[PDB]
Amino acid sequence: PAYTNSFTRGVYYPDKVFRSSVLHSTQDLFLPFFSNVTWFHAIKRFDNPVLPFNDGVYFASTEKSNIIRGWIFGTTLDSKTQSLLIVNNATNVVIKVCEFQFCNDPFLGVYYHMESEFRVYSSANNCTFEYVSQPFNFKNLREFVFKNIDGYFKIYSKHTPINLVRDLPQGFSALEPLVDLPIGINITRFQTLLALAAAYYVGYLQPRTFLLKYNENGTITDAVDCALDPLSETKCTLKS
């Protein structure tokens, strides 16, 4: 597996509270600064494992031509227990929660000069939640953070233009929340959905304290990891 460095990526708004020209300290689940984010490359290569989903997962994909389509969330993934399913197809996407008979290697097949193969499960029995929205080098960066607290599934996202070939960009940009779903199921493992040169990185969130800097506009323009180094510890201690 390939490892790369997530410099200041993975910062999201922890709550729907507006703060102007203040420095706020939050203790939540964040991706640590300069973390050892795992790199997966799909070329030749079609990386699609069953990567665990513990204490949230930071997902970033320097994607071109819209290759990444969705993710699988659940604990067993064999219709024995309820599972969470998201596909961002070229339609009004269904975030659908049923007991799916997931196959060994789920994927989407697109004919190279349309999507003709969907290949995700067999039986959509015992359905409970069917939210629907957004009817549909590397030039687009798609950063995603998935959290599962007390049955509330939270997703944060932010799209920023990049012009980098095969590495995570350096900079700061906070991920705004876009959905919040009361699925109410346990999640242990997760798996991305790959459409048949695209690479995605999977960071893992940990409970840390961050010093978020809000400007007069309410946007988080900077952050400090209160456990990266003694200088940042002093910055957090002085709240400056």
Next chain:
Amino acid sequence: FTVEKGIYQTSNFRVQPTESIVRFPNITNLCPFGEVFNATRFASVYAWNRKRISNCVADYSVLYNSASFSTFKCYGVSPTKLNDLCFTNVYADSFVIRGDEVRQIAPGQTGKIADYNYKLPDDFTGCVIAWNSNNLDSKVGGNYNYLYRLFRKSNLKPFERDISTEIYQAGNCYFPLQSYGFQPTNGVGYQPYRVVVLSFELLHAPATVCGPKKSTNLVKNKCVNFNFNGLTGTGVLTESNKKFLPFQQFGRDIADTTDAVRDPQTLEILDITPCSFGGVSVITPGTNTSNQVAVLYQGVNCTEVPVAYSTGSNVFQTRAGCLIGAEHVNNSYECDIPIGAGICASYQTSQSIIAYTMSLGAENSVAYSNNSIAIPTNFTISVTTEILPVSMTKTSVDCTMYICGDS
């Protein structure tokens, strides 16, 4: 019973909330109660359906208020409190039974229907809704399309559906299912009676089904008891130039207090200014000197304190609050009773309390010159007193006796 000259703080002043307003998001998505109840064809009693209801509002404005339902009884809560009680996944079961078998639907009831095809547990907490549907499910030749389990090996457990059509051995071979003789000429109790039961498991998952949340009109520039999406508080709402992000709802200041909220119906930002308050101080000379007093509402406008000595007849807006009962004068004297921000009050001539800007002293211009000196030709021997505390009263307190005397 006597009070010395000075200014004394008394019970504080605070503007009371004029009214209470509640603001909640638009009630858009409602549960498919219309489809559940007004379906053209209902299921049979032996094959009672089970439709799941979730992520919707379960308002009963058109259900409970309607007289079309001849039987409406909830075993766990009242219909009045149903609309304001949040719930979880709701299962709707509908069937058509005989009018005399409606009583069997109650928990802990007997009967062939209750013992063979539909039993409710004794801890049932949901709602059972039934009404006559003779004209809807009655056929002149007998509506035999509806069947009931007449024969079975043994009593069935609650919340169980039986579909097996195997012949029941009485010893003596009988088909377990028999058709109902529903006709328009049937008497009351034998006519078909459509029944819908609202059963739901609660307090085991995040709440996805909740009742309607009524909201009132929004008032501004008035101290009210607001409630924005469950964020309660008291203050004065005013339109603000703050620019929230689209996903943000509340605003918090540097001290972690809510000072700006977004109205869930019309997306606008309202500044939350606290209702005006402040201590009430009473300016008084000695009791024997006079019995008239002046009141001070510290840090309070009396374009506003009349809302609460509301007549006035003598008001004065100062920087330390505004003063009621004291006459403002242009003359400046030595400070007699301090009020604040350079304003002092005194009792003078007819006699009344006067408020004035205190004077620092008599103005003097020294006759300075580069060749002029002043030399005293005399002297006075001055004797003045200085008083200094040296000690205070010794006090010994027995901690044990004070806390737990003799015990």
Next chain:
Amino acid sequence: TECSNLLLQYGSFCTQLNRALTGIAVEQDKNTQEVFAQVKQIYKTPPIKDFGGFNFSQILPDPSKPSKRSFIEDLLFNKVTLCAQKFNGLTVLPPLLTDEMIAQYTSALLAGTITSGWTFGAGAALQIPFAMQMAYRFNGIGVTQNVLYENQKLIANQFNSAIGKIQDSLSSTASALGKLQDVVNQNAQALNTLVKQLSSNFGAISSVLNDILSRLDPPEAEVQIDRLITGRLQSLQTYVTQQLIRAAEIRASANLAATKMSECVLGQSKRV
């Protein structure tokens, strides 16, 4: 109302706290009075500023400014940089002596000094030429008058240059008024902590009385509200105690400042 009735069981803690906080404010007013109100009359410098070549222009009042404050005084006021807390029963009473009145007292002291010497601090202000007063002070430090009378130009130039250097030091260095900035910061931080302690559970289910009351029945609500009451009362008591200690320190400083005014401005001190 429920929390208020529960608070009634604790006695006169709130009355004690308000009494302490009121004594602190009265002591602050007394501190300012003792430091500055040391002049019987409001002396004014003569229109002709013929003080023997000494330049007091930058410490004397400037009429152009609405607040008749000296150039150095306005420098200091700009250097020391300083509603929200009001939501929770926290008020800031204004001081009795306004800034303009304190500036008037300072101007009276300075004019009385530069026009009389030390006579206004012991009786009626007796005028004396400023060079002659400086000769008196040279005698006070043990140097004969002829030294001043023969080096008057040099001494005046040295004094003027020193005042200019004071101007530059104040207008460049910001840490100079560190003590005043520290007092302001300490008070603001104490109030901020007091407000922020209203968001603590203190062991209860929630920090919001409305949430407790709504989600609990009256007796369990009473238990949780009692937990919140204990926490908030402890926070208020800690704030009041630390304010009393800080007010004691400020009173010591104010007494020192009053002594310094009396012994250095109203006279000449032989204390090293």
Next chain:
Amino acid sequence: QIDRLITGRLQSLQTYVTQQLIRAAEIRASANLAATKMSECVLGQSKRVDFCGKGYHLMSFPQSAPHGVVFLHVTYVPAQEKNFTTAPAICHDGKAHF
């Protein structure tokens, strides 16, 4: 109930003792000032301005008071000033006289 009463009464006693300690510190400062005033005004003549009363200090007399001391400061106050023309020095024979 006994524990609730104990907690309340113990907190009351702690508050009393803390305020008494603070007031004792203030009274100690006042007593130190009074002792300094005794030593420097009663036992001698003080040149410190406005220390032993307003004016030019001559002497002080102590007087005992309940839980305190009263100082009678005897001072010298110039009374009737006159206007005079003054000069820093005098020219006599080409020499300056001070």
Next chain:
Amino acid sequence: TECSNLLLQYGSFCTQLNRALTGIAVEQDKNTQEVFAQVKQIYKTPPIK
């Protein structure tokens, strides 16, 4: 850990306590400096007494 988490519910009481103790500790050094560091020049007596 359990006791620390329960103590976190009390706010910044112990942060205030730490600040007060640190202030006292710094003030001790300040007192010593004010009393003794009066001259910024280490004079030494001549060998002849």
